[PDB]
Each structure stands twice: as C-alpha cells, then as structure tokens.
Motif scaffolding. Structure first.
Motif, short mmCIF file in Angstrom:
data_model
loop_
_atom_site.label_atom_id
_atom_site.label_comp_id
_atom_site.label_asym_id
_atom_site.label_seq_id
_atom_site.Cartn_x
_atom_site.Cartn_y
_atom_site.Cartn_z
N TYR A 1 0.82 -1.19 0.00
CA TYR A 1 0.00 0.00 0.00
C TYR A 1 0.87 1.25 0.00
CZ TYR A 1 -3.59 3.36 1.03
OH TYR A 1 -4.46 4.43 0.96
N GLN A 2 1.84 1.32 0.90
CA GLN A 2 2.69 2.51 0.94
C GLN A 2 3.35 2.73 -0.42
OE1 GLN A 2 3.11 4.83 3.45
NE2 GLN A 2 1.41 3.73 4.41
N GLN A 3 3.88 1.67 -1.02
CA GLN A 3 4.59 1.84 -2.28
C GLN A 3 3.68 2.22 -3.46
OE1 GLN A 3 7.63 2.29 -2.30
NE2 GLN A 3 8.46 1.19 -0.53
N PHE A 4 2.46 1.69 -3.47
CA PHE A 4 1.50 1.95 -4.54
C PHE A 4 0.78 3.28 -4.42
CE2 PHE A 4 0.54 -1.13 -7.86
CZ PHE A 4 1.47 -2.12 -7.58
N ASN A 5 0.91 3.96 -3.29
CA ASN A 5 0.19 5.19 -3.03
C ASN A 5 1.16 6.34 -2.86
OD1 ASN A 5 -2.98 4.62 -2.71
ND2 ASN A 5 -1.77 2.82 -2.13
N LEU A 6 2.08 6.24 -1.90
CA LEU A 6 3.13 7.24 -1.71
C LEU A 6 4.33 6.97 -2.61
CD1 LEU A 6 4.22 9.73 -0.35
CD2 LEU A 6 4.90 8.28 1.59
N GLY A 7 4.81 5.73 -2.63
CA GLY A 7 6.03 5.40 -3.37
C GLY A 7 5.94 5.65 -4.87
N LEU A 8 4.74 5.52 -5.42
CA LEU A 8 4.49 5.80 -6.83
C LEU A 8 5.12 7.12 -7.25
CD1 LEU A 8 2.88 5.50 -9.49
CD2 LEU A 8 0.90 6.40 -8.32
N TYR A 9 4.95 8.14 -6.40
CA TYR A 9 5.49 9.47 -6.65
C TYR A 9 6.80 9.71 -5.90
CZ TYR A 9 1.11 10.33 -8.91
OH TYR A 9 0.06 10.30 -9.80
N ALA A 10 6.91 9.23 -4.67
CA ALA A 10 8.06 9.59 -3.86
C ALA A 10 9.30 8.76 -4.18
CB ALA A 10 7.73 9.52 -2.39
N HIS A 11 9.16 7.52 -4.65
CA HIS A 11 10.36 6.77 -4.98
C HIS A 11 11.12 7.41 -6.15
CE1 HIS A 11 13.14 3.45 -5.76
NE2 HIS A 11 12.88 3.03 -4.53
N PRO A 12 10.41 7.85 -7.22
CA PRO A 12 11.16 8.49 -8.30
C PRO A 12 11.91 9.75 -7.88
CG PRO A 12 9.07 7.71 -9.12
CD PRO A 12 9.03 7.54 -7.63
N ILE A 13 11.32 10.51 -6.96
CA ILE A 13 11.82 11.84 -6.63
C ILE A 13 12.75 11.85 -5.42
CG2 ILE A 13 11.12 14.18 -5.91
CD1 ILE A 13 8.44 13.56 -7.53
N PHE A 14 12.36 11.17 -4.34
CA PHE A 14 12.96 11.33 -3.02
C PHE A 14 13.98 10.28 -2.61
CE2 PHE A 14 10.95 15.05 -1.34
CZ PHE A 14 9.82 15.19 -2.14
N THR A 15 14.21 9.27 -3.44
CA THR A 15 15.23 8.26 -3.15
C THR A 15 16.50 8.54 -3.95
OG1 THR A 15 14.54 6.62 -4.81
CG2 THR A 15 13.50 6.49 -2.60
#
Ligand SMILES: O=C1O[C@H](CO)[C@@H](O)[C@H](O)[C@H]1O
Ligand SMILES: [Cl-]
Ligand SMILES: [Cl-]
Ligand code: NA
Length: 473
Positions: free
Chosen positions: A248-262
């Motif tokens: 859930y975290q990855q499909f909701n927040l991570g969808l946008y935040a993994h590309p940008i914030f990692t």
C-alpha cells in the motif's frame, strides 16, 4: 512540556485551493478549467449539483481571507494558483494580466500582514484546452507545465519562497480512472491513471530543474510537491499482512516519492513488478505501467527541497487482491478496510486515527532518509456548526502525534497548514462536507467567514506555540 512545544522555526498556518474558494470562474479573462466543465456539464456527479462558480468568492474577498489569517495568527498561508486564470488557453501564448494582478494583490496583502505565501501551482484545475489534448495521460503536458511554472516564478518568485508543484497526484490521477468521478471523469483505470502519474512526475522534474536553471540563484526559495498518503495498519500482526501494508505505501506514496525522493529513483520495484506480471497474465504485449529511461531516472531523482504531505486517515490492510481488472487498487495487492471502532467524520473515507499520523511520519523518515516534511494538509469534516468539538479533538490529537514524531522520533517536520482556512467547495461533495476552521454562509452573497471553536483553539496553539494543558494526555 517539551513534547508539547513547537520547535522555534516550525511554521504554522492554514490552506486553501483555487477552485475550492475563488469563484469568479469566467471573470476578467479567466479561461475554463476541467472543474468548470464537470460542474456545468455533469451536475449529477456532484452533491446538490453544486458548482465552484462563486464558492467563497475569494477572487473578490481575498482581503477578508487575509484578515482571518491574521486573526488566526497564521505564519504561512498555503493557497493555489488557477492555471486558467493566468494562462486562459493553457499554453503560454496569452498571459492574463488580471490573473497576475489578482495573485500579486493576494501575495502583497499577505506580506503586508506578516504572513508568508506558500503556493501550490497545480491543485486539480487543469485548463480545458489542455484536457482536450488528453490531459495528464498526454506527456506533452510536462512541457506545458514547465512553461506555466516559468510564468509563476517570473511574476511571483521575488516574493514567494515556498512552492509546491502539484497537490495530490495520487488523487487527481483518479480522474482518469472513473467515468463519474474527479475531473475530467474519464474511465481508463489501470491505464490512463498510470499515464497521468508518469506525466506529472516528468512535469514536476522539469519545474524543479527550471527553478534551478532560471530562478533559484536570484530568488532563494524552495520547491517541493504535496503527496497524500493514508497510514495502512496491518489487520493482524502477520508477516503477510505487513507485506500488504508495504505494498500500500509503495503503490500510493512510493508511486510518486520513490522516483523523486530516493537516491535510486524510478518507480518502486514492487509497483513495476506487480503491474508487469498482471499485464502479462491478462494478455497485454506491454506492461500497463509506463517506463522511465535511465536518463529520465537520473533527471527526476533529487528534484526536491522538501516533501509536502497531506495526511488525514488510516486504513487496515490484509494480504490479498481485490478490485477490478485493470486498476491500481487491484495491482496493489492489499485488501483495505476501516475499523468500525474508529471515530467517524462527515466523509465516508475519513476516520479519526491520530496514531496513524505518527506511524506514517516514521515510515517516511525511514524510507526517504528523513527529508524535511511540511504537512500541507490535515483536517476534519462535519456537516455544519460552530461548536466543532470533533474538529477541535481531531486537531489537538493530530498535532500531539506530530509533536511526538518530531521530539520522540526525530522526524524533521518543518511546518503544518490546517485544511482548511474556511468551508469551501469540497469537490464532488459540493458544500455538503465542511472542512473549515471558519464557517462560511453559502446562502449569503457576502460570504461572511466566522470563527468556529477550532479556529479559536488553533489561534491559541499558534499564539502559545504549545498544546494547551487541557488537551494533553
Ligand atoms: O487532500 C485533500 O483533502 C481535502 C479534503 O478532502 C480536499 O478538499 C483538498 O483539496 C485535498 O487536497
Ligand atoms: Cl494478531
Ligand atoms: Cl486549563
Ligand atoms: Na509573464
């Protein structure tokens, strides 16, 4: 009382969005947006057939908004700019001076009253001329978004030092996943919503790079993005239910935040892998999830000066799969429910789960290496009333939980703006669900703003810089 005191530099305030408050939908050169279209052509999608044609009339009454912000003691006012008020054709060929003047007038009024502007560039009100090209699923909008941002930085960036590119792309992408939902109300679940996300991420990155190249040296501000996320609590303590909550975290927040914030960038692996597998199993030649090239991954990662978070509620997650094929929910591999014991609001989706806020802040800290986090929305709905005890309790509990995250858990939370300064047009819920700390009479042409108990309590918190004793555990 340390755990009850705000850090000295922490910024407190309140938030609104353009379509929700401004009115003046076709005044002085403003062009039509997708919410004008939805509420005019499809009133059957909206409670009461409501429109934002007038709303709080903040286009005319912006000085009254500043007055109540000053009464509240807000240090920051988060508001959005209406793209079609500034660029009526969406493209940057025509700049509407009336729109420039309006936002300058608001900015100047805020500054004259000691309130810092925080500007969301895009809070859901896409010009219809750009939707007519397909809207967010069409990657050409990334360059159009850059050009819109340039107009904003050029005109306002001498006085605005806090920017959010987008508000809740997780939500507005869903406008491409239902025929009766969020504008533009297009039914391409599991396909067009992912394309919309992809364009938004590209657009965000272009805007950030634009700021670096053309404006930062002179203006010295910060550019972030506002991402919504619910806490997802494992339904039971099993490893399998924990896995579903991570999904859930990855499909909701991570969808946008993994590309940008990692450091790695790109979409989360679980997102890529689950969609690839599901797409293959359903017979598609190509995955339904768009791809970034390596060069794009590098361009996009690192495009942030802070993380904006909109937090409201929690869900329970358990292992399993449900939802329609294809859809983001089905792809995400979690079965979501609400606990019947959680206090309710006037919004079906919003239950009061304050400890979920602390859990989410810790999840973010651990996933993204403790980025500076600005809480750009948090709030509570009722159906009306000034003695808004539910809202008061919602705020005091959430602020307590956030303060524990800061002081006990070391989360770098830097600011907080309550949603919302005033009751406003709540999207498909019309004026039926109230989120304001100030009430507004939508049957009174003057749209007076009057403080609720929550406005008084938040003023007390803002003035004293602490949680009052009577609200402590
Ligand atoms: O996250 C949000 O929640 C709010 C309440 O649903 C809504 O009004 C804002 O526009 C939205 O950004
Ligand atoms: Cl258990
Ligand atoms: Cl007391
Ligand atoms: Na201009």
């Amino acid at each position: 009382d340390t755990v009850y005191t705000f850090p000295d530099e922490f910024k407190l305030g309140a938030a609104t969005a353009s379509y929700q408050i401004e009115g003046a939908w076709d005044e002085n050169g403003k062009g039509p947006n997708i919410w004008d279209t939805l509420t005019h052509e499809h009133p059957d999608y909206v409670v009461d057939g409501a429109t934002g044609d007038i709303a709080d009339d903040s286009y005319h009454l912006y000085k009254e908004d500043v007055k109540i912000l000053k009464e509240l003691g807000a240090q920051v006012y988060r508001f959005s700019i209406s793209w079609a008020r500034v660029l009526p054709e969406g493209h940057d060929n025509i700049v509407n001076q009336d729109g420039i003047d309006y936002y300058n007038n608001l900015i100047n009024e805020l500054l004259a009253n000691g309130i810092e502007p925080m500007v969301t560039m895009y809070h859901w009100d896409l010009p219809q001329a750009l939707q007519d090209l397909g809207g967010w699923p069409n990657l050409v909008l990334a360059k159009y978004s850059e050009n819109y941002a340039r107009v904003l930085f050029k005109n306002f960036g001498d006085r605005v030092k806090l920017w959010l590119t987008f508000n809740e792309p997780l939500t507005f992408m869903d406008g491409y996943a239902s025929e009766i939902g969020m504008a533009p109300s297009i039914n391409t679940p599991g396909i067009g919503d992912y394309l919309a996300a992809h364009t938004v991420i590209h657009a965000h990155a272009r805007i950030y790079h634009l700021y670096d190249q053309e404006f930062r040296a002179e203006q010295g501000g910060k550019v972030g993005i506002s991402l919504n996320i619910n806490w997802c609590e494992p339904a039971t303590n099993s490893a399998e239910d924990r896995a579903s909550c991570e999904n859930y975290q990855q499909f909701n927040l991570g969808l946008y935040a993994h590309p940008i914030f990692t450091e790695e960038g790109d979409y989360p692996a679980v997102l890529k892998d689950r969609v690839s597998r599901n797409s293959a199993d359903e017979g598609y030649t190509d995955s339904r999830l768009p791809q970034f090239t390596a060069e794009e991954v590098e361009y996009i990662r690192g495009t942030h000066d802070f993380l904006g978070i909109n937090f409201y509620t929690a869900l329970l997650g358990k292992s399993g799969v449900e939802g329609y094929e294809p859809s983001r929910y089905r792809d995400s591999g979690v079965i979501l429910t609400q606990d019947a014991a959680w206090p309710i609001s006037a919004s079906s989706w919003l239950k009061v789960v304050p400890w979920g806020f602390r859990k989410e802040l810790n999840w973010i800290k651990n996933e993204y290496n403790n980025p500076p986090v600005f809480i750009t929305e948090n709030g509570f709905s009722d159906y009306g009333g000034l003695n808004d005890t539910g809202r008061v309790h919602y705020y005091t509990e959430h602020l307590k939980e956030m303060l524990k995250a800061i002081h006990e858990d070391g989360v770098n939370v830097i600011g907080y703006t309550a949603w919302s300064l005033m009751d406003n047009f709540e999207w498909l819920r019309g004026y039926s669900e109230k989120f304001g700390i100030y009430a507004v009479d939508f049957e009174d042409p003057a749209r007076p703003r009057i403080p609720k108990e929550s406005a008084k309590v938040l003023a007390e918190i803002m003035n004293t810089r602490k949680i009052p004793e009577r609200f402590r555990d």
